[PDB]
Design an enzyme around this catalytic site. Structure first.
Site, mmCIF file in Angstrom:
data_model
loop_
_atom_site.group_PDB
_atom_site.id
_atom_site.type_symbol
_atom_site.label_atom_id
_atom_site.label_comp_id
_atom_site.label_asym_id
_atom_site.label_seq_id
_atom_site.Cartn_x
_atom_site.Cartn_y
_atom_site.Cartn_z
ATOM 1 N N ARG E 54 57.959 88.713 70.707
ATOM 2 C CA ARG E 54 56.844 89.934 70.392
ATOM 3 C C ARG E 54 55.122 88.518 71.120
ATOM 4 O O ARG E 54 55.106 88.633 71.515
ATOM 5 C CB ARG E 54 56.119 90.540 69.273
ATOM 6 C CG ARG E 54 55.616 91.706 69.676
ATOM 7 C CD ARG E 54 55.733 92.119 67.885
ATOM 8 N NE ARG E 54 54.964 93.674 68.080
ATOM 9 C CZ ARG E 54 55.808 95.022 68.377
ATOM 10 N NH1 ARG E 54 56.867 94.270 67.710
ATOM 11 N NH2 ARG E 54 55.901 96.075 67.436
ATOM 12 N N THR E 55 55.958 87.578 70.383
ATOM 13 C CA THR E 55 54.320 86.228 69.879
ATOM 14 C C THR E 55 54.964 86.009 71.020
ATOM 15 O O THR E 55 54.132 85.038 72.402
ATOM 16 C CB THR E 55 54.238 85.172 69.094
ATOM 17 O OG1 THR E 55 54.148 86.383 68.052
ATOM 18 C CG2 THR E 55 53.578 84.518 68.794
ATOM 19 N N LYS E 84 69.180 68.486 63.131
ATOM 20 C CA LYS E 84 69.320 67.671 62.436
ATOM 21 C C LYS E 84 70.567 66.276 62.362
ATOM 22 O O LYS E 84 71.256 66.325 63.032
ATOM 23 C CB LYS E 84 70.554 68.760 61.011
ATOM 24 C CG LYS E 84 70.821 68.022 60.175
ATOM 25 C CD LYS E 84 72.279 69.160 59.478
ATOM 26 C CE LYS E 84 71.453 68.703 57.733
ATOM 27 N NZ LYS E 84 73.002 69.349 56.898
ATOM 28 N N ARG E 105 55.989 77.344 67.394
ATOM 29 C CA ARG E 105 56.074 78.280 66.346
ATOM 30 C C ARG E 105 57.576 77.695 65.522
ATOM 31 O O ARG E 105 57.954 77.373 66.791
ATOM 32 C CB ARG E 105 56.492 79.493 66.683
ATOM 33 C CG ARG E 105 57.113 80.703 65.338
ATOM 34 C CD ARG E 105 57.115 82.025 65.797
ATOM 35 N NE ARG E 105 55.721 82.797 65.617
ATOM 36 C CZ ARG E 105 55.103 83.737 64.664
ATOM 37 N NH1 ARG E 105 56.307 84.323 64.379
ATOM 38 N NH2 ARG E 105 54.287 84.837 65.147
ATOM 39 N N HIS E 134 48.718 80.597 62.219
ATOM 40 C CA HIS E 134 48.542 81.391 62.710
ATOM 41 C C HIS E 134 47.439 81.432 63.670
ATOM 42 O O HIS E 134 46.452 82.919 63.768
ATOM 43 C CB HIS E 134 49.613 82.537 62.951
ATOM 44 C CG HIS E 134 50.182 83.123 63.886
ATOM 45 N ND1 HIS E 134 50.415 82.706 65.105
ATOM 46 C CD2 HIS E 134 50.801 84.374 63.742
ATOM 47 C CE1 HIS E 134 50.998 83.926 65.758
ATOM 48 N NE2 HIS E 134 51.274 84.805 65.057
#
Ligand SMILES: Nc1ccn([C@@H]2O[C@H](COP(=O)(O)OP(=O)(O)OP(=O)(O)O)[C@@H](O)[C@H]2O)c(=O)n1
Ligand SMILES: Nc1ccn([C@@H]2O[C@H](COP(=O)(O)OP(=O)(O)OP(=O)(O)O)[C@@H](O)[C@H]2O)c(=O)n1
Ligand SMILES: [Zn+2]
Ligand SMILES: [Zn+2]
Lengths: 310, 153, 310, 310, 310, 146
Positions: E54-55, E84, E105, E134
């Site tokens: 959605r974001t 990693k 994000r 946020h």
């Protein structure tokens, strides 16, 4: 030494009428007086390359009830075998180097009979090989028809459900065709019909059968009603639902059943037999599963023992 | 006010009486068509003696007049019912249900994979072919089933 | 026949004071003279629908130390059950067709008591049902308080840690409330406090308790210090860390402990009890786990045996 | 405006003969004289809740050849929307505030029709919804049939394979049945045959159809041969391998086909079409997949642009 | 240049009242008179190391409505960067040589602030960093509050749900506390209440707050009702289901709300807001999600463009 | 003119809207006997009420106490020859089987062939209901809400 001594039980097509009676009379004796140390000091491998809990717990309890030790694995979800390309000939050539009988289930058809070419003298008993055989399920069903009906011949046996891919109805029709005067009623959706090689063997042996579309057409005459599960993916969601989900049994349908009629289902039952059937005298699906113990015990007793005491 | 009695109860002033409901469809209709969520006086008679079915059900909803399409939604449950509409103790109207073209809300798509199960949409079926035996097609998955089948799942 | 004979051990709320003493005196006898063939020829199912190694290996060793056979599965990671929608009523109706007692752990609360409605006469013993009960952990803890303290009444018992969701502290507070004069000290982060239904039952029985914020406030008076793990996800990383990670025990804190005080932890301990506590005489967490064998053995001996020889 | 302006494209059932010809007319126009800035400043969403990269790349390339922007996702075992808890209806309600059109492929039937009630004035175009519809595949198939044969009426079309579950073969038969005089041959394994509803519709329209058992018996009269992939899960391995001397096509089989006969396949073509067919002139599946660009350009152009003068 | 030109947008804490009003002023401008070629030739990177579709779609649609290019990724169980071994610092150092701005994000807090020390002159915009910040959610919430109420001062805002862990409710309270005279009502389950730091800050500012137990007691005085989702993992099923007669909102509850009262929710809204609220005039969560486009267009426009004359 | 009955049960003063709950929940229509129901019946006598009259059926003891959670001020009346032979108020029972769902979504009652069962406890201000499977205890308002 008994006929079955040290044999591989791979297929129902390999057992004679005689062989099948012997297993069934030994099951009856062990159910009546236990022999808890008969396989004392034997070690048996439970190799389930494909997981099947129902079948495994049953097979190992009956190895435990005759005094034997069990080593083994259940896989499908990893237990390191076939690790780094190891063939099944090789795994079996190594497991038979130290156990006294191999019980095995495997995804591919033919796998228990291949094990046989590599196990030397350790008997191999088949607990299921893909869509091919499952002897020990047919032995337990037969035992249950015999114990409840008193006979294995002159029966009216209805097979309801997915008959095209139900590996157990195909072997039970072949076993029962060994005996006389049985009459078969198949009730299947058109997409899930009893294949021709079955029908063709029944015709050639002069055995009577017929297709019906609902259980009400035949309930009155029926001794054994053997239900199978339709798996919803053999059909699409709407094929299952649309008018073919009516191969479902309920208590109401049992009204006119003969007093001796029994309902058998190899299980999981999920949809096809409604929960209210359980309270009726005809529900024998669970007692059928308990008979798996004596049928299975009898095969391990006959195969590991030269002479049997009874 | 008119000399009711229970073998065929009497007179509501103004409102609807659905009579000649087959036995055991009456409660079904109360719950399914949510008839009960009103403050009006409803009187209902279950398993009654009458006009030859022998035994029937009947519902009386005063001051509510449910009509034309409401009456038609009753058709695969009570096709032989009569919806009398009453005003000042006179049956000023006698309808009977006919097959609708759409049956919203009440049915359930037998198709386990259609989206209508999981969501804030109400069911909707297109109806086909009168009395020799009805086909219902889901709005959403466009799968056509026999009414006998939608009427169980 | 003993009271527990053929009972289902599902909840601590179902066992009386009497019942709890009996189990504890039998554990004490079996710990003192072994009975390695008492359950000879019994087959017991170890059904762990949810995996728990600590609990399983303990339960099966104690079935093995009384002579019984074990068949079973550990799942969470697949072992074919519930395959194709098979209900738990149905799995248990089939497993009780051939084992003599079912030990089971399951994710959902209530699952061992449902098994009871379908197992016929085969006892069901609960090894954990979601956030509801775990009797056999409370029996072993009780046994350990009794063996080290000499009594189960008139104790000062501190419960430190996550008390809100620690399913074992909730049952041990209910069991201990069966006995007299015990005093409870709860030491928990505010977010992890001992729920009201517990406190409300203690008040109603007139039992004394109190909240403290550090173990130093109460160490001197304490007989049993029962630590629980805070799980770091019941808090965020910084809540754990920020000032609440001080429900941690170390050797230094034990200075003024009474000579009889013992530290108990159902385990895994990871953070809360520092490694230097192990060398002290008060560390009894490991000997608590070894007592799981006798507590567990005692329950299987009492439930399968009409009369017990001692 | 054009008839399809701002319309939702969900089922082939909903587009008239005329709408089908408009789309096909436009797509020949865009193929011939391309207009790369037609959807300049529009932002389309490519919501593939079910991955299909071939269909997704065809559509996104259609969006970019008309100059549009693209946001979206695919989801073989991944990314958040629809969640489990978050409804499709709320996903769409939120995305239709961000974009100008939504192309979507979902695994459950009617998902696109549900979407339509939540997208506001935003058009939604179905890229596949369970086993129900895939209109942009039918639109390119007809464009390829019209572009190789010259018309969409009076054709001898052979459809072969899994006629029971190919969504594409069900759709193509509805669409070709809006045009006149078409004759249909359906060569399928009788376990995978055309449903009775396609056939009952075809007889209400007076259309001619016949069913055949191998392509070799119609090779001679045919214009379009539309191969479908036989879905080996809906079959037993042995069943799969049993059928005749198969229904796979090889160049040898083509030696009788008319010169204008073209072999079409929605792809993938694992097995049923041999590589030697690829070099014959009758092979047209790859060209069929390039026409996917012009069919979907057409639909997007008519839906988002008011009237088109190309 | 504008005050935010080339600035990093990482915490709401770092933007003055004035910067908050500039963004909101711009976003009303872009909503009204759009400028689709403003970031022509810029290439933004959408680095979602944690998927949030959605974001991500809101931001990428913001990038494309201003004509910018987009490269990037999402990573529910997938794609290589951060590896990693490979550090975030080296990922950013390499990506900031390729692009003009980085929206990111990440699941660990401060990831965006770390990034800032490695992106060179390239601006980084935080889309979520663990439980910390946020800011683009707070920016659209204030834009929706300002666009429905007419101001951002002197509001009676009710915040409801998981006030302890909603990052959005912590942020919105800091931001609304830079404007004057706002009164706050916090209706939460006391296990999930507003942290003492939000409250201690609010009392240092002289701001009024009160805590309530159900929305019904403030429904009457309120302007904005900001529902949050209650996160059922941080709870026991029975706890989750226990609370009062819940803190979910339904139209019945709304029958007293002021005419300008709007219900906001960051989404998803599984349970706490019933569908009947969606049709009332007070429902504004979907409109709130469309304003996400204009809030993020604003931020990108001011950060990448020197001064703005729209 | 309404229904005086010869023998049966008459449930009277059902609180308004509980009237239909009770038919559903207690499966009172699955009978062939005449039932006559009144909804939103006038009760200057008690606001507004409902009333079911079910003939040749006597709903007793246990069956009456069930109804207390729903219509706690209902007076059941039996009739065996044209008049009230007994008026019976519902008292709260000790167990409520079948009609109630466990609020607990992890409770095994949800997926299985099990009849729900709750132990009732009047803890002044409310009735707590403890599930027999979970053993989780909830306010009767949480369980009846669902
Ligand atoms: N004010 C009135 C008048 C009539 N009725 C109901 O209206 C129904 C039927 O209408 P009517 O034409 O008056 O009797 P019938 O001719 O028997 O109707 P039908 O032949 O369709 O059964 C009866 O059940 C009667 O109870 C009513 O409740 N209230
Ligand atoms: N042959 C009869 C006798 C009585 N009743 C019903 O039985 C109920 C019993 O009420 P009753 O004791 O007769 O007088 P009430 O004062 O109405 O009872 P209550 O104190 O509850 O108001 C009444 O509703 C009446 O309709 C009936 O249907 N048939
Ligand atoms: Zn449907
Ligand atoms: Zn419960």
């Amino acid at each position: 030494a008994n006929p079955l001594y040290q044999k591989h039980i791979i297929s129902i097509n390999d057992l004679s009428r005689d062989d099948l009676n012997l297993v069934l009379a030994t099951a009856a004796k062990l159910k009546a007086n236990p022999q808890p140390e008969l396989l004392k000091h034997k070690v048996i491998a439970s190799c389930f390359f494909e997981a099947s809990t129902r079948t495994r717990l049953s097979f190992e309890t009956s190895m435990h009830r005759l005094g034997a030790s069990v080593v083994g694995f259940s896989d499908s979800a990893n237990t390191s075998l076939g690790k780094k390309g190891e063939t099944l000939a090789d795994t079996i050539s190594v497991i038979s180097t130290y156990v006294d009988a191999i019980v095995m289930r495997h995804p591919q058809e033919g796998a228990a009979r291949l094990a046989t070419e590599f196990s030397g003298n350790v008997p191999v008993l088949n607990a299921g090989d893909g869509s091919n055989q499952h002897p020990t399920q047919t032995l337990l069903d037969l035992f249950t028809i015999q114990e409840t009906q008193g006979r294995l011949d002159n029966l009216h046996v209805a097979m309801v459900g997915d008959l095209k891919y139900g590996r157990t109805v195909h072997s039970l029709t072949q076993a029962l065709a060994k005996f006389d005067g049985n009459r078969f009623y198949f009730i299947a959706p058109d997409a899930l019909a009893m294949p021709q090689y079955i029908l063709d063997m029944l015709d050639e042996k002069g055995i009577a059968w017929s297709l019906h579309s609902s259980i009400e057409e035949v309930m009155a005459e029926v001794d054994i009603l053997y239900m199978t599960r339709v798996q919803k993916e053999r059909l699409d969601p709407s094929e299952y639902a649309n008018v073919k989900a009516q191969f479902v049994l309920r208590a109401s349908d049992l009204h006119n059943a003969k007093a001796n009629m029994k309902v058998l289902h190899p299980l999981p039952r999920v949809d096809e037999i409604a929960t209210d059937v359980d309270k009726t005298p005809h529900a024998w699906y669970f007692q059928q599963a308990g008979n798996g113990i004596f049928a299975r015990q009898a095969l391990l007793a006959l195969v590991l023992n030269r002479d049997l005491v009874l | 006010m008119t000399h009711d009695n229970k073998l065929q109860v009497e007179a509501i002033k103004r409102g609807t009486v659905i009579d000649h409901i087959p036995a055991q469809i009456g409660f079904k209709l109360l719950s399914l068509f949510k008839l009960t969520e009103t403050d009006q006086r409803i009187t209902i008679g279950l398993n009654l003696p009458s006009g030859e079915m022998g035994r029937k059900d009947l519902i009386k909803i005063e001051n509510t007049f449910l009509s034309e399409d409401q009456v038609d939604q009753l058709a695969l449950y009570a096709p032989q019912a009569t919806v009398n509409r009453i005003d000042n103790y006179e049956v000023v109207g006698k309808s009977r249900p006919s097959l609708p073209e759409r049956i919203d809300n009440v049915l359930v798509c037998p198709n386990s994979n259609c989206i209508s199960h999981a969501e804030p949409v109400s069911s909707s079926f297109a109806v086909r072919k009168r009395a020799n035996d009805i086909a219902l097609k889901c709005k959403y998955c466009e799968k056509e089933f026999s009414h006998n089948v939608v009427l169980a799942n």
